[PDB]
């Protein structure tokens, strides 16, 4: 019973671990998915100026 | 004649001794025997969301 509690407790442990790791993930490709929005944004405004 | 023999009465002492609930039963009970299962699970989210971060 000890020994199968441990093992809870260690793969608790990772599972909260890699899920940061994951959190960190998402967020860094969001801010990155936002900047690339911005410069597509750019790129819609040179594409309009150029159609005038 | 006479004199001394047998005497005493009210004096004595006794310890005490003690058994436990049932219920007790094994050390497995609740939150000991489910963790087996508990921990098949557990070991299902951490895969489940290894494919999460992967």
Redesign the interface.
């Known amino acids: 019973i000890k020994f199968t509690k441990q093992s809870s407790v260690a793969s608790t442990r990772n599972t909260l671990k890699m899920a940061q790791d994951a959190e960190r993930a998402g967020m860094n490709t969001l801010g990155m998915l936002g900047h690339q929005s911005e410069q597509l944004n750019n790129v819609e405004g040179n594409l309009d100026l150029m159609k005038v | 004649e006479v004199e001394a023999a047998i005497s005493d009465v009210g004096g004595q002492q006794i310890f005490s001794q003690a058994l436990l609930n049932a219920n007790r039963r094994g050390?497995?009970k609740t939150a000991?025997?489910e963790?087996?299962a508990?921990?098949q699970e557990?070991?299902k989210?951490?895969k489940s969301?290894?494919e999460?971060?992967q």
């Open positions: 050390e497995a000991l025997a963790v087996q508990r921990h557990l070991l989210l951490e969301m290894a999460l971060t």
